[PDB]
Amino acid sequence: AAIREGWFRETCSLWPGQALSLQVEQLLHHRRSRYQDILVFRSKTYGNVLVLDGVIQCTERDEFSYQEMIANLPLCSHPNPRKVLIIGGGDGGVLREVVKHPSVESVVQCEIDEDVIQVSKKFLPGMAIGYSSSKLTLHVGDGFEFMKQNQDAFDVIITDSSDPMGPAESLFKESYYQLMKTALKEDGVLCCQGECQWLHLDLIKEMRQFCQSLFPVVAYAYCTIPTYPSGQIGFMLCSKNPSTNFQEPVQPLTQQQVAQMQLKYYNSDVHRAAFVLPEFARKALNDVS
Amino acid sequence: DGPAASGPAAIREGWFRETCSLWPGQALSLQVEQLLHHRRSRYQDILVFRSKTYGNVLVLDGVIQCTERDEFSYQEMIANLPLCSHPNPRKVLIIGGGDGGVLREVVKHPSVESVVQCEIDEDVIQVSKKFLPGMAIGYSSSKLTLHVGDGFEFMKQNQDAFDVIITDSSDPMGPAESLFKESYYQLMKTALKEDGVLCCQGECQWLHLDLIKEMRQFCQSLFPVVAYAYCTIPTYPSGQIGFMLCSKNPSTNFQEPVQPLTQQQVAQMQLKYYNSDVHRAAFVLPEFARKALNDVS
Ligand SMILES: CSC[C@H]1O[C@@H](n2cnc3c(N)ncnc32)[C@H](O)[C@@H]1O
Ligand SMILES: CSC[C@H]1O[C@@H](n2cnc3c(N)ncnc32)[C@H](O)[C@@H]1O
Ligand SMILES: [Mg+2]
Ligand SMILES: [Mg+2]
Ligand SMILES: [Mg+2]
């Protein structure tokens, strides 16, 4: 239905007047779960593609960008992250990146939709390999609700959500950020999908402003990824540790570590550069008017 | 091995969809508010439309060249990366740049005394003046000498003549094909003065890493210093594009601008993308591209 004449087209009122389309090789899955519409297809040139409510979540070809950054930005900004919470991350990709750190002993994942877990294991095996980690404790539920049952529990919280629509709506609210503050340990750090500086600079400054009322350290970084709207996405980074410097990794990686972790996107120079914004965005977020 | 092909420019159900064999299996579509121009010149097919959300859009042989909303990224970077990597650029050559936007950025440098542009297609110049006035304003500078012709042939005519050469081209296709060839890079080397620098549209690291590496290899046999930088721009394929940078000066360090700009200079030049930090970060590539371009195998 979103597939016509051998192409899938992604449209959304959050990025009006533009669309990415990916040519379809083979439909793999299309079924509605309790929470959302779940579409999976083998594309011609991007490998397998997961689509939720018409919005591309990942492709095999470029997923490593978002997966490595959302994991390593917060992890390399904590001097010893031992207990990690992931909210969302149904494809298993973030889990896969997180567990590569020896410091990490325990990762709890809270995913709302078990059908996403199932189709990922089947059609996104290079990402859902994450689910086979001995470091994982898996919960099926609303992350916003699960956050309330945890206080002072986590070194790092990662919110790997789709856009501020449907089941992910509340994950972008100031109330949810308060819940994360409470679920973090006294020196804990968070990283949430924070949207696109070429599309949502208003949301970005607004989130930044409310986060600054909750946390001593707030930062915005971004990464490039062909199949997200406008070809990139950002991350909201917050710490309860007043000493956190997100822009200079507290855990730099050697070239050998980058090689051993099989990283395709992230390294310490990339981490530094991710905070260097286009002048329009730097000005909007930092300068006074 | 075959020649590259793009889908012929067409508007269908109120959307323009860009397709090309240089980025197979993916497409950007922009919703159309108003069709403004669609005619073939003596060189190429020219589509101009007013989009719903990106202002006016220039399309050449089915390939998006610019949109009013995001043009400043490519325009500012292709201009300032070489200019701020030269201690005193006085004489500038632009090949292509029919929309006039690169001219607009180059002339903001007081050091720049003369800009020569060689653009092949007189019709692009006219549609840009009408439909892209914020870019085509570049044409109304007294610093400009304009030629209409093929930039490859034009390059043969100049020796030891320019501090900076910018090739602001579309893709290695149609009239632009020769602009990506080693023989063209040799011609530019000759057209540059002894310590001159060049910057060319150098394609996308998420799409064209093969071409990027190949160009890099042949440029390293010609110039002491060769680099690759990229900028983000939502309406080029995969949301970004890069730049080939070469210098005949062995002392040139492209990542560290030899001409840093103060915040005041950035304000004075009305820059919306480029600044000296952005300059530095634009050479920091994702691990896969850093590896492909720098590690020996
Ligand atoms: C594919 S990565 C994004 C994941 O976030 C999940 N998700 C969306 N909303 C919520 C929520 N409120 N709590 C937990 N997970 C969510 C989706 O089901 C998806 O698998
Ligand atoms: C819109 S910016 C790119 C410009 O490059 C121009 N162009 C393409 N091939 C050549 C060439 N061989 N010499 C000069 N300009 C060219 C196109 O006509 C376009 O206006
Ligand atoms: Mg090292
Ligand atoms: Mg010179
Ligand atoms: Mg200053």
| End-to-end C-alpha distance for chain B, whole angstroms | 24
Centroid of ligand 5 to alpha carbon of B266 (angstroms): 9
Task: Classify A23 as helix, strand or coil.
Answer: strand
Alpha-carbon distance of A243 to B60, in angstroms, equals 52
Task: Identify any residues that bridge with B114 across adjacent strands, giving them in sequence order.
Answer: B91
Active site residues of A: 160
Per residue in A105-130, is it b (16+ CB within 10 Å) or e — as a string? eebbbbbbbebbbebbbebbeebbbb
| Contact assignment for A266 to B278 by CB distance below 8 Å | no
A14, A20, A21, A72, best to mutate vs chain B, most B CBs in 10 Å? A21
For residue A109, the one-letter residue type is: Q
| Residues in a beta bridge with A110 | A87, A139
Q: Is residue A63 within 8 Å of B66, Cβ to Cβ? A: no
Q: What resolution in angstroms does the PDB record give?
A: 2.0
Q: Which of A56, A111, A131 to mutate to test the pocket of ligand 1 (most atoms within 8 A of CB)?
A: A111
What residues contact A4, with CB distance under 8 A and at least 6 apart? none
Question: From residue B101, how far is each of A280, B43, B47, B56, B98 by CA, in Å?
Answer: 18, 21, 18, 14, 8
Which ligand lies nearest to the CA atom of residue B264 in the structure? Answer: 5
Euclidean distance between CA atoms B205 and A116, whole angstroms:
31
Cα of A98 vs its chain's centroid, Å:
12
Q: How far is CA B227 from CA A263, B31, B213, B256, in A?
A: 23, 36, 11, 12
Q: Please report the DSSP string for B169-238 in residue order.
A: ---SSGGGGGGGSHHHHHHHHHHEEEEEEEEEEEE-TTT-HHHHHHHHHHHHTT-SEEEEEEEE-TTSGG
Q: Do B206 and A198 touch (CB under 8 A)?
A: no
Give strand pairing partners of B225: B247
| Residue A286, CB-side half-sphere exposure with 13 Å CA sphere | 12
Chain A nearest CA to B18, separation (Å): 10
What letters, b where the CB count within 10 A reaches 16 and e where it falls short, cover B40-51? eeebbbbbbbeb
Is the distance from CB of A49 to CB of B51 less than 8 angstroms? no
Q: At what angle do helices B209-220 and B287-294 cross, to 10 degrees?
A: 40
Contact present, A59 and A51 (Cβ < 8 Å): no
In chain B, % helix, strand, coil (3-state, to 5) comes to 30, 30, 35
Residue nearest to atom 15 of ligand 1 (CA): A88
What are the structural domains, with CATH classification, of chain A?
1-61 (2.30.140.10), 62-289 (3.40.50.150)
Q: Phi/psi at A48 (nearest 5 deg)? A: -80, 150
How distant is the alpha carbon of residue B243 from its chain centre? 7
What's the count of helices (H) and strands (E) in chain A, helices before strands?
A: 10, 13
CA distances from B78 to A161, A209, B73, B189, B235 (A): 35, 34, 9, 18, 16
B195 alpha carbon to ligand 4 midpoint, in Å? 4
| Contact status of A231 with chain B (Cβ, < 8 Å) | yes
**Which strands, in side-by-side order, build the sheet including B240-247?**
B144-148, B114-119, B91-96, B162-168, B192-203, B240-247, B225-232
Residues in chain A with CB shorter than 8 Å from the CB of B272 are 278-280
Q: Å from A247 to nearest chain B CA?
A: 13
Distance in Å, CA B57 to ligand 3 centroid: 45
**Nearest chain A CA: its distance from B52 CA (Å):** 6
Name the structure determination technique.
X-ray
**Structure token digits, residue A277:** 């914004």
d(CA A185, CA A179): 12
